[PDB]
Amino acid sequence: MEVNQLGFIATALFVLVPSVFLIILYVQTESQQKSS
């Protein structure tokens, strides 16, 4: 299968970068009670 080369860093980073943001913002808040 001859495909584009950035498929991984493209699709992948697309997932992990914004996702990591949300992840952060959640556990940053669920830790107001020091819980988490």
Binding site: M1, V3, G7, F8, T11, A12, V15
Partner: peptide, 30 residues
């Protein structure tokens, strides 16, 4: 290769179904 990328998404998503249904923030009747 790229077909794992497809299957990885496909899957981690089925699990975003797990949490969002079973460890979802509950409805508080107050």
């Amino acid at each position: 290769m790229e077909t794992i990328t497809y299957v990885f998404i496909f899957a981690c998503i089925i699990a975003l179904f797990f949490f969002a249904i079973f460890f979802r923030e509950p409805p508080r009747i107050t």
